[PDB]
Amino acid sequence: QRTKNISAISYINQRNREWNIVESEKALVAESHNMKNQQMDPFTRRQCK
């Protein structure tokens, strides 16, 4: 009963989540790579003492 559509939807979902995981990992490695300079106005963090 689920051979079509019901199974294709699951296949696309699994492949899309895997693609999202790899996309996140590549974004992370790229963010680590481009560590030249970070000068931005709208961001701040506390620094006690």
Partner 1 sequence: EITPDLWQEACWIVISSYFDEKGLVRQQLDSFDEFIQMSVQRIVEDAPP
Partner 2 sequence: MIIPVRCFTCGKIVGNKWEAYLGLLQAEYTEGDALDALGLKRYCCRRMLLAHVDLIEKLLNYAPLE
Binding residues for partner 1, rule: CB under 8 A, are 24-25, 28-29, 31-32
By CB under 8 A, residue 16 contacts partner 2: yes
29 binds, among partner 1, partner 2, none (CB under 5 to 8 A by kind): partner 1
Query: Binding partner of residue 18 among partner 1, partner 2, none, CB under 5 to 8 Å per kind?
Result: none
Is residue 1 close enough to count as binding partner 2 by CB under 8 A?
A: yes
> What are the DSSP calls for 1-49, one per residue?
--TTTHHHHHHHHHHHHHHHHHHHHHHHHHHHH--S----SS-------
User: Using alpha carbons only, what angle is made at residue 44 by residues 29 and 34, rounded to the nearest 5 degrees?
Assistant: 20
